[PDB]
Design a binder for this molecule. Structure first.
Ligand code: SAH
Ligand code: SAH
Ligand code: ZN
Length: 842
């Protein structure tokens, strides 16, 4: 007896205990999304099974390094071989599985690398001749209540991978039951010849003793097996049987081509930049060899120390949300060791097929037209350092350094160099999302060149027709409605999968055309920004090595990296361009992306001049977020130009017609939907609204360290005064907002920062600010009669409120409301003895 002591404890165990025990303290991956998307026909990004994740756990620790020809016996739907398709050093993948009634048939998928992946069904790998291969995977092994049975099957598959192994071969072989001495004897033999060791995957459920014979591992067999046997036993009795959740594998998209992938850098530009990082180390520096990067250019690494609080005031006043998981889990921070590297390899380590010649012309003329149209009633310019320092409204405190005078001599050095045509301190530092931090000095230069776009309001709706820059949420809704009035098809709000990684080099050269309309000292500077630091970036990213974390530095030309405040401009620009070119395609201006006939290149030019402005007004565009009401619904199939520019829509098959909204109130825009609210006096309001959990959860989270109690309480007061001015139409949030203000000293000025208009920051009475923004100043309201009690401002309907997230009618919330006064005093008592107003209605 051994781990068989485990198996009878398990076989002798009820149905529900079994399911409880199965997923206890194990690691799981959220498959709800992929499983729903694969039914809807989405044939890329998604993994086809839990298997991809499982295998990724081995690969990212180098326990298997798949490479070359990859045979995959018992490939099932394809989880392992698809995953292997996108891996760097892999050149071919063949998957063989039985298939047939009772077994899994493979799933076809446009997953990254799929072109190198041949899955065959109707194949008994026990009956087929071996083939040359450089890495061999196998995942066969039927479990059974009976341990002797499984050793049988386990030994069968062990006797099979041996025919396929050579001695240099890489492998990952499931050992269904490694605790029987039948298997413990053969595995020792096998380990003597071919090496490796058994390794347990934490994503395996507790109901199977699977261990994987993986090539690049080492260790003693019997002990490794017994370690797992007691770990699985311990877990029968485990208190706290919740399961930890990983996000699933993002398996990419599109085909793989040895020639086309891989950056050829122009080290005559990124150069003076890298060897500077080198010198700042040169000791710990080393050119790693197993670097993961496959679409970026590697250069070297160096040591680096590996690298959100709850707001008690808000939290104490939102007690019914202490058990909603979509609220309390936003405060948790998911610091897996490979978690950053995973987002990089799946989402940023991607390439985009260069557009066709005809796409490129369409873009170049539309951009050429647009930049001119944007600059009719506007003129570029540099932006002062004093102008820059002025944003002392949010060394080691960009403020403190904004005057260390030294600073401006350092910014002064490289700035001449940009004028000569080089940089040295213009590197990005990377940190589901990525943010490309940059040196506080470098962000000056780019502000001094391109600051004018975000500072003279070039994408203001009034100046660029499609923009919504500088429009509060109390206007975007009326603006969408204004578009719905336009006569045409349905409203389309397609999102792009990972927009910034989809910026092409052509995209960047097109946007650089704003330097046409510049000239002088200025132009040369805004030429360096574009050419030197936008089209030719160098980046630092951390990465975990078996020698401890290192900071690789890599470089890539493609994609959008820049100041999150400057990229907004260009993203709107190019998206405006892209949505125009799509509108064309639907209307029929041009008919092929490969060539633009001279007589079509004219139609494009005409249309642009004859209706271009009108087409722009059919669009609400904020960066990659867009809303389009075109002439007819032929827009919903005009996908050739969209796809070829790289702006691949998110969450449907590449050539699936887009779905249009026939009710603007459901059109998602700027992370909100907008309801149409009618007062008791019958004036109509268009109000912003979103899942109320993302609102509560946001408000209960604090930025940074050192928040005192007076700050923590003024941050909550910001969130509350914002709720009552924007989300006043939701019961919970207006109650919670009133509670917060009754519990924070009424004389304290809210100061902090909510999101990214901010009328809720005044210390005025909120009802006054309400009347200003919603009545005496929105244009969509001609009757300027003031409302003089909160009992005049309306709510959504009950059913809408609880649909958009409310808790009204749940007993816990009802209890929260009867006692809100007890809660306000808990917090007031905590704050101390100050002057409090009482906003709660009776
Ligand atoms: N004799 C045989 N020949 C080929 N495939 C077999 C087989 N016996 C079982 N299999 C198949 O092997 C698969 C292993 S489970 C496959 C999961 C896979 N690793 C993934 O990532 O998706 C099962 O679908 C089973 O049908
Ligand atoms: N953060 C961590 N904490 C504890 N163990 C870790 C770890 N990260 C990795 N490991 C373990 O360290 C191992 C590195 S695998 C090393 C394989 C090696 N390249 C060879 O050729 O033999 C993984 O198996 C994992 O089990
Ligand atoms: Zn709503």
């Amino acid at each position: 007896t051994l781990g068989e002591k485990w198996k009878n404890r398990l076989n002798a165990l009820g149905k529900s205990e079994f399911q409880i025990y199965k997923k206890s303290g194990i690691q799981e991956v959220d498959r709800t999304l992929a499983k729903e998307g694969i039914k809807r026909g989405e044939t890329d990004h998604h993994a086809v099974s839990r298997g991809s994740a499982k295998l990724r756990w081995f690969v990212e620790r180098n326990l298997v390094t798949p490479e070359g020809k990859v045979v995959d016996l018992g490939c099932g739907r394809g989880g392992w071989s698809y995953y292997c398709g996108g891996l760097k050093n892999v050149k071919e993948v063949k998957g063989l599985t039985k298939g047939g009634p009772g077994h899994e048939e493979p799933i076809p998928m446009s997953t990254y690398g799929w072109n190198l992946v041949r899955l065959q069904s109707g194949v008994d790998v026990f009956f087929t001749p071996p083939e040359k291969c450089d890495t061999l995977l196998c995942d066969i092994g039927e479990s059974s209540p009976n341990p002797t049975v499984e050793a049988g099957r386990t030994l069968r598959v062990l006797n099979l991978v041996e025919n396929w192994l050579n001695n240099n071969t890489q492998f990952c072989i499931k050992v269904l039951n490694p605790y029987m001495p039948s298997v413990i004897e053969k595995m020792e033999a096998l380990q003597r010849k071919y090496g490796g060791a058994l390794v347990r995957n934490p994503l395996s459920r507790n109901s199977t003793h699977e261990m994987y014979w993986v090539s690049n591992a080492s260790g003693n067999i019997v002990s490794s097996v017994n370690m797992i046997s007691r770990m699985l036993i311990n877990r029968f009795t485990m208190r706290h049987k919740k399961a930890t959740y990983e996000p699933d594998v993002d398996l990419g998209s599109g085909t793989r081509n040895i020639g086309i992938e891989s950056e050829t850098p122009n080290l005559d530009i990124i150069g003076k930049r890298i060897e500077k990082i080198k010198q700042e180390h040169e000791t710990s520096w080393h050119y790693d060899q197993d670097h993961p990067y496959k679409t970026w250019a590697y250069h070297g690494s160096y040591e680096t120390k590996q690298t959100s609080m709850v707001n008690g005031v808000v939290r104490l006043l939102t007690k019914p949300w202490d058990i909603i998981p979509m609220v309390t889990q936003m405060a948790m921070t998911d610091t897996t060791p490979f978690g950053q590297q995973r987002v990089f390899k799946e989402k940023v380590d991607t390439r985009t097929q260069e557009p066709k010649e005809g796409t490129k012309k369409l873009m170049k003329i539309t951009a050429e037209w647009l930049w001119k149209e944007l600059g009719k009633k506007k003129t570029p310019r540099m932006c002062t350092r004093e102008e820059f320092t002025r944003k002392v409204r949010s060394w080691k405190s960009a403020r403190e350094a904004v005057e260390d005078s030294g600073f401006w001599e350092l910014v002064d050095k490289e700035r001449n160099l940009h004028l000569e045509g080089k940089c040295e301190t213009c590197v990005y530092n990377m940190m589901s999302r990525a943010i490309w931090y940059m040196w506080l000095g470098a962000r000056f230069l780019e502000f001094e060149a391109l600051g004018f776009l975000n500072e003279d309001h070039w994408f203001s709706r009034e100046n660029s027709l499609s923009g919504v820059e500088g429009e509060g949420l109390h206007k975007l809704g009326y603006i969408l409605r204004d578009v719905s009035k336009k006569e045409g098809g349905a409203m389309y709000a397609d999102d792009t999968a990972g927009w910034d990684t989809r910026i092409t080099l052509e995209d960047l050269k097109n946007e650089e055309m704003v330097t046409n309309h510049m000239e002088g000292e200025h132009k040369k500077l805004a030429e360096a920004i574009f050419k030197l630091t936008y089209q030719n970036k160098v980046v630092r990213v951390q990465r975990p090595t078996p020698r401890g974390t290192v900071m690789d530095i890599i470089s890539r030309r493609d994609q959008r990296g820049s100041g999150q405040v400057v990229t907004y401009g260009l993203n709107t620009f190019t998206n405006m361009e892209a949505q125009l070119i799509r509108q064309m395609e639907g209307e029929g201006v041009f008919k092929s992306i490969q060539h633009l006939t001279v007589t079509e290149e004219i139609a494009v030019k005409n249309w642009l001049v004859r209706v271009g402005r009108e087409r722009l007004s059919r669009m609400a565009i904020s960066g990659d977020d867009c809303v389009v009401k075109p002439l007819d619904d032929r827009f919903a199939s005009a996908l050739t130009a969209l796809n070829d520019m790289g702006k691949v829509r998110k969450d449907i098959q590449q050539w699936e017609p887009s779905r249009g909204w026939n009710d603007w109130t459901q059109v998602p825009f700027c992370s909100h939907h907008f309801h149409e609210l009618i007062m008791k006096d019958g004036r109509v309001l268009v109000v912003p609204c979103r899942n109320q959990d993302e609102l509560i959860g946001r408000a209960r989270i604090s930025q940074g360290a050192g928040w005192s109690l007076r700050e923590t309480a003024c941050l909550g007061k910001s969130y509350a005064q914002m709720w009552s001015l924007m989300y006043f139409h939701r019961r919970d949030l207006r109650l919670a907002a009133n509670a917060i203000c009754s519990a924070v000293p009424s004389h304290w000025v809210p100061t902090s920062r909510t999101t990214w208009t901010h009328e809720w920051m005044t210390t005025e009475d909120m009802l006054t600010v309400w009347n200003r923004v919603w009545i005496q100043e929105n244009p969509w309201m001609e009757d300027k009669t003031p409302v003089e009690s909160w009992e005049e401002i309306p709510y959504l309907g009950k059913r809408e409120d609880q649909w958009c997230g409310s808790l009204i009618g749940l007993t816990s919330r009802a209890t929260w409301a009867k006692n809100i006064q007890t809660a306000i005093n808990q917090v007031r008592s905590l704050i101390g003895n100050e002057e409090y107003t009482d906003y709660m209605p009776s």
